[PDB]
Amino acid sequence: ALSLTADQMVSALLDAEPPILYSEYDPTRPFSMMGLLTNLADRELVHMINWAKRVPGFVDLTLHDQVHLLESAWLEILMIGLVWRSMEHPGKLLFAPNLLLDRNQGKSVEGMVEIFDMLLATSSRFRMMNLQGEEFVCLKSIILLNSGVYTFTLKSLEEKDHIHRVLDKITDTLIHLMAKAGLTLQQQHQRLAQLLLILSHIRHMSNKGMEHLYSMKCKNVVPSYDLLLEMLD
Amino acid sequence: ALSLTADQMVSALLDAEPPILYSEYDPTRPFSMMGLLTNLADRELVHMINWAKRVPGFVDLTLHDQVHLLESAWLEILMIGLVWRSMEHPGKLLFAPNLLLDRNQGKSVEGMVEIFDMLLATSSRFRMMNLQGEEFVCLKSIILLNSGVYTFTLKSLEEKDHIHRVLDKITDTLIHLMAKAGLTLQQQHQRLAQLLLILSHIRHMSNKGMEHLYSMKCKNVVPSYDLLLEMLD
Numbered sequence: 001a002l003s004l005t006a007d008q009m010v011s012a013l014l015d016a017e018p019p020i021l022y023s024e025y026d027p028t029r030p031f032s033m034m035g036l037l038t039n040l041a042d043r044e045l046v047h048m049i050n051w052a053k054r055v056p057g058f059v060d061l062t063l064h065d066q067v068h069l070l071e072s073a074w075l076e077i078l079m080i081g082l083v084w085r086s087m088e089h090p091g092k093l094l095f096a097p098n099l100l101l102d103r104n105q106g107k108s109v110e111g112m113v114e115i116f117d118m119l120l121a122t123s124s125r126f127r128m129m130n131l132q133g134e135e136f137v138c139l140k141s142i143i144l145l146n147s148g149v150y151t152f153t154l155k156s157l158e159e160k161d162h163i164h165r166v167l168d169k170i171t172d173t174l175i176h177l178m179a180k181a182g183l184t185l186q187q188q189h190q191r192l193a194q195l196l197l198i199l200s201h202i203r204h205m206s207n208k209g210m211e212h213l214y215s216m217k218c219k220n221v222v223p224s225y226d227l228l229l230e231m232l233d
Numbered sequence: 234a235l236s237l238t239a240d241q242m243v244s245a246l247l248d249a250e251p252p253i254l255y256s257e258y259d260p261t262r263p264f265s266m267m268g269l270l271t272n273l274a275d276r277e278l279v280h281m282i283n284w285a286k287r288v289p290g291f292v293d294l295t296l297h298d299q300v301h302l303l304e305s306a307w308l309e310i311l312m313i314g315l316v317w318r319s320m321e322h323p324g325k326l327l328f329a330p331n332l333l334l335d336r337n338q339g340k341s342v343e344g345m346v347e348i349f350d351m352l353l354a355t356s357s358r359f360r361m362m363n364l365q366g367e368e369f370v371c372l373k374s375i376i377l378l379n380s381g382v383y384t385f386t387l388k389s390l391e392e393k394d395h396i397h398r399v400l401d402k403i404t405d406t407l408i409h410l411m412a413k414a415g416l417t418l419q420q421q422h423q424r425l426a427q428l429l430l431i432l433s434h435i436r437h438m439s440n441k442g443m444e445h446l447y448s449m450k451c452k453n454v455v456p457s458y459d460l461l462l463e464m465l466d
């Protein structure tokens with residue numbers, strides 16, 4: 001992983017991309033929104049595990065540290081994927097190609113419209129920046145490696161060092177993408193910062209979302225350490 | 234603000250720095266922790282308002298947008314200040330020079346030790362990076378301008394554009410600081426990214442902290458829109 005070139009980092013990430021899934025509802029029947037969203041998210045998580053194992057550097061970590069990173073990052077990763085898919089659909093969130101919802105549809109569940117609105121504003125920001133696919137895959141990998149790295153022994157010190165080295169490679173890769181597209185050195189640093197600052201907002205959204213999910217007080221909601229460990233092991 | 238040089242941006246920020254306050258308890262009497270922490274934080278907020286009015290670009294915004302940004306960012310700003318003050322005190326949090334607490338002292342309040350631990354790990358990270366004073370003031374200004382900019386009319390479009398232009402100036406300023414200290418171009422971009430990614434974790438902490446404060450269910454806890462508007466107006 002640490003010997004990959006920038007172009008090789010980009011190809012590895014593009015090749016690891018998970019598929020876009022569909023909502024499971026009978027389209028011949030009349031139009032539970034949270035049920036549909038939960039079932040979709042549960043299926044996405046399985047693909048998320050397979051993706052994570054393909055991000056360079058990730059399978060070099062201990063299984064316990066892989067679980068901790070996914071546990072910290074899984075809702076941020078679902079959210080950045082949602083916002084990316086929704087970028088060319090102003091005013092709507094493309095949960096799936098058969099489940100395109102507006103903010104009015106969000107008002108059906110108490111507390112959801114506020115989350116819908118933050119996600120729509122994020123998609124708006126990505127549109128304004130003209131975010132590219134190759135930049136998006138870099139940012140999603142940065143979420144995976146960064147979100148849990150501050151919340152974890154000699155082995156732990158070695159693991160954190162490695163994670164920071166991999167993050168440095170992804171930064172190099174972003175900058176290389178921006179240099180390729182012709183931006184100046186000033187423009188490169190400015191855009192790097194613009195991109196990474198949106199990650200702060202994605203964290204914020206994930207925390208507001210997790211508050212919603214925990215408030216459900218339900219064993220079939222939020223993947224456990226043990227479920228994540230079973231799927232990763 | 235947008236015509237400031239990098240050196241002028243740095244001096245303006247260093248000159249705007251608020252003072253380090255002391256805890257109000259009688260030091261001759263025997264050793265409520267949350268009472269002491271709340272009273273300190275309430276006094277810090279008043280200085281925070283005066284600081285914010287001195288960050289270049291901030292008073293160019295509407296009063297309502299100034300309130301919204303402070304409302305989003307005030308706990309992150311208290312937290313980054315705490316972690317900076319604690320950097321040369323391994324294992325301790327320097328809430329004030331007369332109130333230096335360890336994680337064991339945090340266990341006295343339900344849910345607090347988890348927050349204490351995240352703040353201590355952040356201070357540890359800043360130590361590992363050897364964060365400098367001039368970098369710290371840049372990052373605190375970036376929190377102020379970025380935390381609320383995704384959650385806000387023609388005026389609103391003009392305000393968001395301005396905020397992003399000011400953020401771009403602070404990015405330039407960070408990079409200039411790093412070039413001055415002798416780092417290579419690679420090292421500059423890498424360190425910029427390292428710094429901005431810690432801001433994601435600071436957001437995370439602020440959200441966990443706000444959950445604690447809201448759970449108190451108390452009108453004397455968390456500054457209202459109206460109190461912030463009164464102090465800013």
Ligand SMILES: Cc1cc2c(cc1O)CCN(CC(C)C)[C@@H]2c1ccc(/C=C/C(=O)O)cc1
Binds near residue numbers: 079081208
């Ligand atoms: C399919 C999908 C659902 C959601 C998001 C992105 C997605 O790609 C982000 C917004 N979020 C809504 C937000 C309020 C969390 C939903 C959602 C809904 C339910 C669950 C539940 C999972 C579980 O119980 O295991 C997770 C995400």
Ligand SMILES: Cc1cc2c(cc1O)CCN(CC(C)C)[C@@H]2c1ccc(/C=C/C(=O)O)cc1
Binds near residue numbers: 275311312455
């Ligand atoms: C003085 C100070 C207190 C705290 C932090 C940083 C500080 O500089 C961050 C950790 N946080 C503790 C965290 C659990 C919020 C405390 C704290 C405690 C109480 C309040 C209450 C304010 C109010 O009621 O208006 C705010 C911050």
